[PDB]
Structure formats: structure tokens, C-alpha cells
Amino acid sequence: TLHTTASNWLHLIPQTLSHLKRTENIKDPLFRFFEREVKMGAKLLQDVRQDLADVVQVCEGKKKQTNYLRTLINELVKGILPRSWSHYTVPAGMTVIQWVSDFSERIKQLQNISLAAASKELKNIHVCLGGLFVPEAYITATRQYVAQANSWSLEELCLEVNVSFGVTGLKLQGATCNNNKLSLSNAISTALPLTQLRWVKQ
Amino acid sequence: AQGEMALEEFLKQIREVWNTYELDLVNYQNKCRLIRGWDDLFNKVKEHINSVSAMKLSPYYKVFEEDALSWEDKLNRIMALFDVWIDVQRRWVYLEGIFTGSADIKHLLPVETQEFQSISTEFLALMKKVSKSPLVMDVLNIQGVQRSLERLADLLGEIQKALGEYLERERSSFPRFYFVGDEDLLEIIGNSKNVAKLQKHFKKMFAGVSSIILNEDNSVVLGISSREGEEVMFKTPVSITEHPKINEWLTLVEKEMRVTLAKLLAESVTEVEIFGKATSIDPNTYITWIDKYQAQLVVLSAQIAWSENVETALSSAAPLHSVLSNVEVTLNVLADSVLMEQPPLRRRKLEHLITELVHQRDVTRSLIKSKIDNAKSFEWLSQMRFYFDPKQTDVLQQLSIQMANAKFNYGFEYLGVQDKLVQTPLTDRCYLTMTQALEARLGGSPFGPAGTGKTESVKALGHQLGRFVLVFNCDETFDFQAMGRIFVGLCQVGAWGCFDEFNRLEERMLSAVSQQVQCIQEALREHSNPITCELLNKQVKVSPDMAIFITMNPGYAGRSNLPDNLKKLFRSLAMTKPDRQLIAQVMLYSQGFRTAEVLANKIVPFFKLCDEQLSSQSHYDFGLRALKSVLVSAGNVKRERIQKIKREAENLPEQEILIQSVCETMVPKLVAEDIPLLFSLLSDVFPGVQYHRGEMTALREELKKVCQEMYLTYGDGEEVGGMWVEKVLQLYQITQINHGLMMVGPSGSGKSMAWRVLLKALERLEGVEGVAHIIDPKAISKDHLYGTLDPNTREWTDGLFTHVLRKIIDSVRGELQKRQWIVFDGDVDPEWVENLNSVLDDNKLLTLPNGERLSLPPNVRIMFEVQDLKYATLATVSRCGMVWFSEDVLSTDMIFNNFLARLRSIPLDEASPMLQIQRDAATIMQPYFTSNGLVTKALEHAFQLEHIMDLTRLRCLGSLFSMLHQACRNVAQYNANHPDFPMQIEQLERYIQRYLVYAILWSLSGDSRLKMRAELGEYIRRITTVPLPTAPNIPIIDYEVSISGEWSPWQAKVPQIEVETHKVAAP
Amino acid sequence: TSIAIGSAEGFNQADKAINTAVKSGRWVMLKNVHLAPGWLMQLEKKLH
């Protein structure tokens, strides 16, 4: 039936979603920021995995269909995200097939984050800002770490960009970089390999 | 016998002091003697019924029941009769004044005159028989007074409702009568000779008139008075003693105040013109000039003098440098005069003047940083210009306001003090755009998210040009006739409209309103070059001071969008982020601070950090609306700390003052996770920060006394009830600073008891009686919450919230003296709570579809006992103060102590032997409730257990409390059935110790399946050390605790019963 | 005669304007007619 193909694709989807640790008392802002991000990601992964197991069991198994499970069944038949899963910023309501891939990418990023946090050491990592739920929280935590380590003033901190913080996952829009000098080209977008951010007062 | 005789002596004292009481009859203009002195009678009857209620309980009331009960119901019928009597007299006074003073009513309504004469004859017979016998008992002694008074009230209400068509006729006489409701205009027309009744109503008419300065003869109006005590003296006083009508001398007052304000504006600008020619100025003459004039004229004269100085400098760099030097010198003079303690009216005058002077400093620096050589350069033309022509013969047209290809007059409406806004570059862009919309004869329309300064920039532009402004908050019940009525009111008055939240107005109705808007714009285009326009198919006069402004938010709560034909009539303007740095710097410069700029530079990035670093919540606000209240509280606590130091100049720890205000304002919104993040933010932003709190020992001990009175467990801060008392202190601080309050948090955190205990503690401390109105908004419709406009006959009924606020405003029972707390006990959603976004605003007033604006007195606080604030938008979340009650604030041992305290006292069938049964039951259930024991671990385990419904603590806790109350009643009837042998204490122990286990099983597992309650039964069997029915197969649910303290099987209870052949399948 | 559809008075204004336009002959314009299809039915039928 339609539920047989639904169960086949329902076992197809969660094969990239396995688990995430939970790892909350540290002075540095990066540590608590990564701790709450890993907690949010593990909570969302647990909710998504439990809902997928529940809809698998109500498809082919001894589980009856509730109101929430019926809403989940209809929403995943139509392919649109249910409103329970879409907690973070999804651009203009994308389909579920790209969304579970983005979810797996974020979960893998948080898994590497927790692996690095299992052992400063947290400054040595490289981050793609698209895989975080709140990127400006990471930027303000970086600024707070700089102001904490160097005892500087938060009001006049500026940004110096090179191509001591490593940022990956950056994509331009119709421009190219050559020794930190922008040039114009007919290409739609290029990917910046690694971007070094350093906070300077002047 | 001596105690009973003392109670009878107090009863005789009640008899004597009520025999001495009487009705105070005072002659009213040689017509009849009417009774006065009403709040004295109200508190007399209240304290007497309180005395009878206090002597009811204990200890020798039983011998003297009858006389005290007779005095109780005597006071009850006296209270009822006089409560209807005060309303009857109050209605009759203005109805008699209207039916005597107004003419051609008998020609108009003859049946109304005949009835009113019949009820006036009956009423004057009632005055004759009270004036014969002015005793209260004698006036009560006439039979059938209650039926006669109810019929008189019915006849007064009839005559009022059948007269109401005529009032609209009077609304065509005076324009401002359009802004008045039916009862208030009834009082206004009725008491035109009494005059002193009308002074409560002048706040709704004019912007800055609160009461009229009246002669002792009550026939010459000497001037007008604001709500802050500032008064304008009339140069030529209007003679009421010539006997004009009410609208005639009202229009004379309106014209006289404009002529007078223009005259003192001319004198004040002469004073600043002779003052500003000196490069060095004397501060004593400056402060006497400041104390001489009003704030509006002083700021206006400063603007005129600065504009003329810059223009004569630009006639021609060095004169502009001289103007900048004089501006900086006056700024230093204002800073030196504002850094010391001053009276508050001249303090606000100094704050307005220092804001305007630093705005002119910024503008003068903006011209002087570039090369400007002529006054026709656009850079000077891009800012506001003021022109005073002294040779002009008409002082109403003497002042011109010139902005970029736009010229305006001055309406000269009195404003009072009000709030002076900050001229940010965004505010300069808004001013330029909106006056360019006004120059093309187009209405204005700002849009953006809430918390940007949209309607307040419009209102300060209205007060900047001196035009009378009005603010309406339109909801979906705004009709065609209501909008046309307020539009013709704005037409005849000549006032600016500031229609807020237009987007929720029912798209067809928006399109219908667009035609009247087009008619108004066509009339203004005709005026722009005997000019009328058609509203409601009626041609009416349009004043040149017309302007309409549309404050809306795009998709805040899914509100409707504007049609395209109406979008052309209103120019659009977007403000999404105002400059927080400059407004913070100027507010800290204006309150009086040494390191004001560093405080702004350390608090605006601090708000930027705290907007992102804390977790996303439904009730989090870190916008400019919170920043302004934070700065206001910082100024208030800076004045408080300076006065505390000077109770026993010099510098003060301003950093600690700002941090303390930030903590006191922004702690109770946060959940338990976000407190150390804010603490680390305050440590990283401010190095020498520190903290301080508490110091409310009298309030804390009164909270302790009233907590132990009403069976609550007070805490000392770190005890079992410490966090709840701390949150009640936070609620007290927010009610001290804020206006309306969210009490957010999960259900079962004691928020109801929190506001009740705070109200009773404040009543016990300050002596002001606190009355609370609890309203569930979702239990009734929205049209019943606020009121209905009847579509056939345009009458405005009263909703529940409208009736409560109107009863507060009327203050017939002296309700303004008491504290009024209106709590909404529902869930906040933008269907109805978006009608209060002007009440919770700084505009402080309630709008109605009838045009009847109800201002709110500051005694009333509006709170919300609510669950979660997800459904509300930021028009309500950002516009209130949030107190967060987490689920672990009310701990479970607190509820156990409450149950044991309610078990020991307050006997169940409300000393008694069953009260002793309750006490012994409390001592034998005491080792089970406290710490982990039995109840806490089982309740923790039951949360892991799944249920059919959602299981929290309080439902099954109340279930268990009803279980143990029935156990106490069961012991009571067993002692009733066994009089020879009472309830033995070892039997009671071994009975209750099993009844509690059976009860907690049916409480934490009575709402699920058989397997799951069997699981909780075997959990109870495995964990606790109680005697148990020894059968590993049969669960404990299948047993019943007996009266002998043992267990009987439920399967042994059911018999093998057969039923008759006749009744086989009867229901 | 530019009459915006969306109120009862707008409906009566549109009806009297369309009868006057039938008898006299001048144009009649109705603004935003899609806010009331239940009156658009009788408008179309009366026009036919």
C-alpha cells in the first residue's frame, strides 16, 4: 500500500541519524555555548528519532494512530515539514528530504564538537557556521572569549579577516578572493576554504 | 458572663453610635436639601459590618446571637438602600439640570418632560419626607422605600436612554463633545452651574487641561491647570457671569488659551532674545526664566533663538563657531544646574531643555563639519526651522514652522509637561518624511516591528508642531459609523489622528474607510490651494490642522494587509532599528550622570550581547521599550541613592546604580538557566560591578505574618520557601516600577497565592485597602469583554472590563483612594489583548469605538495569571514586565506543609472531636510527607510512568488530599457509631498507614490501565516499609482498607448475584 | 462614482449608482469588488 512505501522511505531516512552525547559548569563562554548547542541538538535528535520510531510502529506494527501520529502521517506523506520538527531556521519551508540531510549535517558537526570537548582545546577547532542553530551566538561567544583572555573593552572591538578563529563553510556571491583582495567574476558563487577572524581594538 | 456582658456593651456602643448618625441635608440652589457626606457613611457601614463579623466567631457570641444578627441585617438593608440611593440622586441632579437649563425640550420631547415631571414630583415628595425626619432609621422606617427607589432608578435610566438622541445634537454644537461618552457628556451638560463636578472631565477634552482655575464666585474662569500642577493664567478672563451657554464659554476658553499661550511665547522669546546675545550667561537669571514660563514655551523659544542664531551665522564659519560656543556654554550651564537636586517640575524643564540643546549642538556640529556658505543650502534646509516675525499683527499667526519646502502654523494647544522625545537621525528622517507627506496633503503611515518608536515619534511630531493629537487603538469591532463619527469629530475639532494597529481592521472595512480617507485628502487638497467635505453623506467643516497617521505592524499576529487604493493615500516609512547609543547617552546625560557616555557605551552593547546569549524564550524582551524603563528606573534609584546619602554634592557610584537597576528590572523575566549567563555578562562587561538586593525587612516580616495567617510557609531566602518569597519580592519591585505585569510560568507555581499574599501584605503595611477584580477573558466573548456598539441605534453598552474601569473612574464609593488590582486569569492571545496595547503603553489610556477615551488612574495595576506567552506577539510581550514562576519554585514539601496546616486547623465539616481526629491524623501522616519518605519518591516515579492524560503534581496531590479528608470523615463516623469505644491510637496508626498507601496508589495510578497501576502497586510493595497484603499475584489495588485497620479483598466484596427474569436488561 | 465595496452603505451606494448609470448613462466604478462575492452574484445577474 501507500504505507508500505512510506515505511520503506521511513527506514531510508534515519540511517544518517544515530546518537549524540549530552556532555555544565565552565568559565569560558565557548564551553557553555557548545554545551547548550549540543544539548539542543541531542534533544532534537531524540525527538525526531522517537517520532520516526512511533510512525514506523503505527505503520507496520501493533501501535494505534493518535491525533499527533495521524498529523505526522499526513505531513510526511505531503513531504512538508511538520511544525514540531522545525524549531530552527529553515529557509521558506523546504522539503523534508533536504531537511533531514541538513539535520544529519548538524548532528555530525555536534558529534565532532562533543568529541573535541571530551579532550585551550576548544579554540583549535574549525567550524562551519551553517551547521549551528544560532551563528551570532558563536560570534558573540568568540568576542567574549577574546575580551576575557585579553582583558579588553567590548565596545571598540573590530573584526580582522584573513583568508585567531577558524571559520569554514563560507560561500561568496559573484566574487573571488586572492591574497585577501576581492575580484569580480561571472561565477555564481565560490566557497571560501578557511577564514581567520581576529578581534582588534584598533 | 462578664465577657458576654462586654460583647453586649460593644453591641450597645454600636446602637448608640448608630443612633447618633444621621443624614447630612444641604440645600441645593434653593430647590431641595440633598444628602452629602457619602464616603464617611460607606466606611461607617463597612466598619460596623466588620465589627459584627469579627464578634461572630468567638467566644461568647452564642448567647448574644440575636441582637448582633439584627444589627447585621439592619446594616445590610441600610447599605443596599443607600447604595441604590446615591446612584438615584447622582442621576437626578444632572437630569434636573438638563431639563431646567436646556430649552425647547418640551417642544422636542413632550413625553420625556411629562415623565420627568412625574418622577420629579415623586422625588420631591421623597425630599420632603427626608427633610422632615433626617434620621437614618427614620428614613429607613417608611415602607416600600426599596421598591420606590428601584423604580426611580429604572425611570432615570429610561429617561436617559430615551434622551440620548439629543446629545448628538449637542455634539454638533461643541466639537470636543464628540470625544465624550454619553454619561460623561450628560454630567457635563447637567452640571454647567455646579462647575466643580465638570473639572473631572476636562482631561478628556484637551491635551493639557486637567481642571479650570475658578474664582471663588464660580463665575469668572481665571485660567487653566495641567495634571502636573502647571497653570496658565488668562490675560483676559472669560465672564461666565454674563450667562453664555456652556459651549460658548468653552469655545471662549479654547480661543483664550491659544491667544494667551501665544502672548507668553512672544514674551519668552523676547527674554531668550535678550539672553542669548551674551557669550557668558548668569545661571540665576536662567533658572528664574525657566521657572517663569511653561516647559513648552521655553523649549520653543530655545528652538527659535537657535534657529535665528544659526541663520544669522549662515548669512555670512566664525559666527557659526560663536553659535556653537554659546550652545556649548548653555549646555554646561544646564548640566551644572541639573547635577544638583531640584524641584521636579523644573527638573523636567531642565531635562527637556538639555535634550533640545544637545540636539541643536549635534545639528550645529553637523553643519560646521562641512562648508556651508548660504542659508539656502539644503543641509541647513534638512533640519527644522522656526520663524518669529515680531511685526506680524496676528499673534496666532506670528510663529511659522518651516521645514523642507513645507510651512506650518502653530495650533497653540496646551500640553502640560508630557514626554520630550529624542531627536535621533532616525527621528530626523521620520520628521522630514512625515512632514513631506503632510505638505502634499497626504496622511502619514509608519510601519515596523514593535519596540522601535513608531507612534511616539508621530505623537512628539504632533506636540512639536503644537497640534492636538489623539491616539486610538482600533480593534475589529470598529465600524463604518464609528470611524465616520470619530472622523467628523476630528474634522470639527481639528486634531491629529494617530490610528494604531490599523492592520487588524477587517479588510472590507479597511476598503470602506479608504473612501472617507480619500474625501478628507480631497478636502485638504482644496484647502492647500468655506471648505467642506462629505463624511457620512454630510458636508462638514474641515480645519487646516487635519492629519491622519497609521501606525501598523506587518504580520505581527497575522493581521490583515492594506488594500492598494488605500496604500496610495498614506506614505510609508520604515524604522527597524533605532540608534540605541545616542538615546542612551542623552537619557543618561539628562538624568544627571558624570560618565553618561561610558555608561551608554557599556549598556548598549550589553543589551546587544544579552539579546543573543540568553536562550530563545516566548517572554523575552531586550528592545528599546525595556531600555527606556531600565533608564527610568536607573534615574529614580539614582535620585533615591543621592537622597539617601544627603539624608545623613560629590560623586556617586553610578555604575553600581545602573547595574542595580538592570538587575532589578531584568532578573524576573529569566528562567533558572539564564541567570548565570547574565551574571557572567555583567562580570565581563563591568569589571567593578558588584551587586546588592533585599533590604525589605518590614515587608518581609509582614509577608511572614500574613503567610502564617493564611496557611502559607514563608521562607527566609535560603529556606524551603525562600525562592517563592524572593519571587513575591520581585513582583513587588516590578509593581513599584512597571504598569502591567505578566506572571508567566507553568501551572502549579503558586502565582495566585503570590499576588494574593502581596496584596494583603501591602494592605497590612501601607494601610491602603486593596481590592482585586479577577476576570477570565476566555470564559466570555470579546464583545462581552469590552462592550457592544448596537448597529441600529448607535449606543455603547458596557463590557466586563469596561464596567470595572468605569466603576473605578466614577469613584462614587471612593475607589480612587483604595488600591485596585485587575488580574486577568486566562491565557493571553492577540484576539483581545491587542485592545490593551494603549493601556499598557505610556499613553496610559483605553480607547473605545464610541470615541469615549478612558484614561487610567495610576492606582490600578493590571496583571495576568497566565500559563505561557507563545501565542502573543511582541505588542504585548515587550509592553509589560514579566515575572517568571518556574515549576520548582513551589516545591512539593511546601504543598505537604500547606495540607498539614489545613488539616490541623480549619475543621472539615465547617475543639471538635473530629478536629482532634484531624490533628492525630496529621501527626501520623507527618513522617510520610516530609523529605523523600513515601509520597515524594512515588510521585517522582509516577512521572516516568505514562498516563492517559497529562500528569503533573497538583492533580494527584489534590486527589490524595481528598482521599485523606474522606479518611478523616471515615474515622469521625466510626467514632460516631462507637460511642463506648473511641478511636484507639494504635488502630488509627495502623489504619492510616495503610489508607495512605491505598490512597496514593489510586491517586498516582487511578488514571491509567490495569497493568500500569499493578506496576505502581508492586513498586510500592518493593520500596516502602509498610505492612502489605501478602499476596504476590494480587495487586494492592484489589484490596480495601477496612474500619478495623486491616485489608479486605475487593474480589471478596463482589457476590455471585442473580437477577430477576423481569429485569434482565433494564438500564 | 467611485464606491468601495465592503460595507452595507457601500452596497446601497453601488446599487443606486448602477441604477442612475442605467438611466442617465455616466460611468460607475466599484473599487475592490472581490471582498464580497455574495453580492457579486446579484451584481452579475442584474447586469445581464
Ligand SMILES: Nc1ncnc2c1ncn2[C@@H]1O[C@H](COP(=O)(O)OP(=O)(O)OP(=O)(O)O)[C@@H](O)[C@H]1O
Ligand atoms: N508558598 C506556598 N505555601 C503554601 N501553599 C502554597 C504556596 N504556594 C502555593 N501553595 C498551594 O498550592 C496550591 C495551588 O496553588 P495556586 O492555587 O496558587 O496555583 P497557581 O500557580 O496560581 O495556579 P494557576 O496558575 O494554574 O491558576 C494551593 O493549595 C496553595 O495553597
Ligand SMILES: Nc1ncnc2c1ncn2[C@@H]1O[C@H](COP(=O)(O)OP(=O)(O)O)[C@@H](O)[C@H]1O
Ligand atoms: N528617540 C526616542 N526617545 C525616547 N524614547 C523613545 C525614542 N524612540 C523610541 N522610544 C520609546 O520606544 C517605545 C516604542 O513604542 P512602540 O513600539 O512604537 O509602540 P507600539 O507598541 O504602539 O508600536 C516608546 O515607548 C518610546 O517611548
Ligand SMILES: [Mg+2]
Ligand atoms: Mg502605540
Ligand SMILES: [Mg+2]
Ligand atoms: Mg491558580
